[PDB]
Design an enzyme around this catalytic site. Structure first.
Site, mmCIF file in Angstrom:
data_model
loop_
_atom_site.group_PDB
_atom_site.id
_atom_site.type_symbol
_atom_site.label_atom_id
_atom_site.label_comp_id
_atom_site.label_asym_id
_atom_site.label_seq_id
_atom_site.Cartn_x
_atom_site.Cartn_y
_atom_site.Cartn_z
ATOM 1 N N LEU A 249 42.780 32.208 -41.946
ATOM 2 C CA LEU A 249 43.605 31.244 -42.690
ATOM 3 C C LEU A 249 42.776 30.085 -43.232
ATOM 4 O O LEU A 249 43.107 29.501 -44.265
ATOM 5 C CB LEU A 249 44.726 30.693 -41.805
ATOM 6 C CG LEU A 249 45.777 31.697 -41.336
ATOM 7 C CD1 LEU A 249 46.709 31.037 -40.347
ATOM 8 C CD2 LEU A 249 46.554 32.272 -42.513
ATOM 9 N N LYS B 140 36.887 27.739 -37.419
ATOM 10 C CA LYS B 140 37.750 28.576 -38.253
ATOM 11 C C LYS B 140 39.156 28.693 -37.666
ATOM 12 O O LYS B 140 39.344 28.530 -36.462
ATOM 13 C CB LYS B 140 37.129 29.965 -38.439
ATOM 14 C CG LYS B 140 36.824 30.712 -37.144
ATOM 15 C CD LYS B 140 35.916 31.917 -37.395
ATOM 16 C CE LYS B 140 35.454 32.561 -36.089
ATOM 17 N NZ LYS B 140 34.428 33.625 -36.321
ATOM 18 N N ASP C 243 43.984 10.209 -40.134
ATOM 19 C CA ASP C 243 43.535 11.244 -41.073
ATOM 20 C C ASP C 243 44.680 11.895 -41.861
ATOM 21 O O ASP C 243 44.688 13.112 -42.056
ATOM 22 C CB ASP C 243 42.718 12.311 -40.321
ATOM 23 C CG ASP C 243 41.858 13.175 -41.246
ATOM 24 O OD1 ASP C 243 41.691 12.849 -42.438
ATOM 25 O OD2 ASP C 243 41.335 14.196 -40.763
ATOM 26 N N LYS D 199 46.275 13.340 -44.828
ATOM 27 C CA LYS D 199 45.875 13.889 -46.116
ATOM 28 C C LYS D 199 46.586 15.210 -46.407
ATOM 29 O O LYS D 199 47.233 15.784 -45.525
ATOM 30 C CB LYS D 199 44.353 14.064 -46.184
ATOM 31 C CG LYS D 199 43.734 14.896 -45.078
ATOM 32 C CD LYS D 199 42.244 15.015 -45.312
ATOM 33 C CE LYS D 199 41.567 15.869 -44.265
ATOM 34 N NZ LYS D 199 40.147 16.134 -44.624
ATOM 35 N N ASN E 276 45.951 18.202 -44.147
ATOM 36 C CA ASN E 276 46.527 18.104 -42.799
ATOM 37 C C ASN E 276 48.057 18.022 -42.777
ATOM 38 O O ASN E 276 48.654 17.802 -41.723
ATOM 39 C CB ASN E 276 45.943 16.891 -42.069
ATOM 40 C CG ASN E 276 44.443 17.005 -41.837
ATOM 41 O OD1 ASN E 276 43.875 18.100 -41.842
ATOM 42 N ND2 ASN E 276 43.794 15.865 -41.625
ATOM 43 N N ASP F 137 45.934 18.968 -37.184
ATOM 44 C CA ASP F 137 44.615 18.393 -36.887
ATOM 45 C C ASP F 137 44.730 16.968 -36.350
ATOM 46 O O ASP F 137 44.817 16.009 -37.121
ATOM 47 C CB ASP F 137 43.700 18.429 -38.119
ATOM 48 C CG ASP F 137 42.253 18.058 -37.796
ATOM 49 O OD1 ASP F 137 41.912 17.814 -36.615
ATOM 50 O OD2 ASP F 137 41.445 18.009 -38.744
#
Ligand SMILES: CCn1c(C2=C(N)NON2)nc2c(C#CC(C)(C)O)nc(O[C@@H](CCN)c3ccccc3)cc21
Lengths: 316, 10
Positions: A13, A20, A130, A132, A135, A148
């Site tokens: 993915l 990964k 974070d 964004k 995410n 994340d």
């Protein structure tokens, strides 16, 4: 104890420098999940142990409709593995890239769910740091799923500060680009950038040279499409206030400032968190192994102990 | 469509 070969490994993915992510089937139940597989060698090399352990620990106790739920955290002699719920809708980054721009209404829907999540985290003394498009993922129904949590700081309440120069360059708040410390308002700036992207179809600032980009963030004024509504303009202006003391949500009330902003006049915030709001876009996934809302770039491809990890949702 | 961003620390 949980191990690698408890799962079937179906499709890649995502792949990055840290590790990964893979679509997996749990052999024991036949159910589908996403697995993030980081290599310890790389983590120890980049000195990201604390951050990686933080990611597990935060997920182990948080429960919220718009945060990704962690099923398992476990490890091998050389790998760290997270098993979370597969967001069939993929990343907002995928969709916004394909559609170029969202309608203010559609943006308002995603924004409201992100505000809900950020209020929850900030009430738990956690700054995400974070926000964004990469995410922010979508579940099979079309609801936001923040992903994340490897740059979260804990123990940060109204007034408390942080010292780690971290985040994503294009999304860094201007105070983070200064010496000494910054506060939890950095998250609202982050929301500001994604909201700006969703309605304006580009970052508010961009240059591939970070030196040039960081100058833009600190110095340059944001522009708005003429057609953009006055309330939309006001929200982005507030979220992207360079001064965090005068930034929307930067006061003591935190998310209540953002929630009470006139851009969300039509939103009932208890309907938001109760999932009573209807998504404007429902992922058209036909099966459970469907990976249409992920890139061919990844899906075409073939396939010493860390303490405070090794968690299970059935046990805790 | 901007390029994939990459998160970082210190
Ligand atoms: C592949 C997209 N993806 C997913 C997916 C799910 N859970 N279902 O589908 N995709 N979960 C991701 C999570 C997660 C999580 C938890 C909840 C365990 O914290 N972190 C991602 O991080 C990016 C880096 C961004 N700075 C990454 C990309 C490639 C390789 C290694 C890292 C990506 C993720």
């Amino acid at each position: 104890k949980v191990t690698m070969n408890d799962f079937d490994y179906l499709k890649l993915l995502g792949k990055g420098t840290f590790g990964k992510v893979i679509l997996v089937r749990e052999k024991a139940t036949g159910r589908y999940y996403a697995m993030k597989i980081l290599r310890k060698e790389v983590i120890i090399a980049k000195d990201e142990v604390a951050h990686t352990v933080t990611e597990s620990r935060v997920l182990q106790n948080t429960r919220h409709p718009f945060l990704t739920a962690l099923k398992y955290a476990f490890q091998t002699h050389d790998r760290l593995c997270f098993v979370m719920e597969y967001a069939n809708g993929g990343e907002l980054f995928f969709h916004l890239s394909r559609e170029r721009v969202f309608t203010e209404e559609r943006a308002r829907f995603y924004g409201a769910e992100i505000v809900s999540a950020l209020e929850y985290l900030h009430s738990r003394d956690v700054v995400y740091r974070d926000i964004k498009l990469e995410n922010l993922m979508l579940d099979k129904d079309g609801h936001i799923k923040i992903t994340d949590f490897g740059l979260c700081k804990e123990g940060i309440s109204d007034g408390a500060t942080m010292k780690t120069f971290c985040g994503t360059p294009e999304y860094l708040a201007p105070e983070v680009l200064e010496d000494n410390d910054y506060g939890r308002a950095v998250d609202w700036w982050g929301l500001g950038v994604v909201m700006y992207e969703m309605m304006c179809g580009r970052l508010p600032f961009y240059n591939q040279d970070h030196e040039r980009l960081f100058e833009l963030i600190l110095m340059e004024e944001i522009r708005f499409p003429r057609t953009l509504s006055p309330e939309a303009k006001s929200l982005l202006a507030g979220l992207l206030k360079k001064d965090p003391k005068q930034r929307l949500g930067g006061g003591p009330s935190d998310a209540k400032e953002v929630m009470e902003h006139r851009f969300f006049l039509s939103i009932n915030w208890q309907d938001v968190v109760q999932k009573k709001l209807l998504p404007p876009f429902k992922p058209q996934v036909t099966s459970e192994v469907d990976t249409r809302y992920f890139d061919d770039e990844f899906t075409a491809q073939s396939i010493t102990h860390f303490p405070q990890f090794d968690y299970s949702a059935s046990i805790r | 469509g901007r390029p994939r961003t990459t998160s970082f620390a210190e």
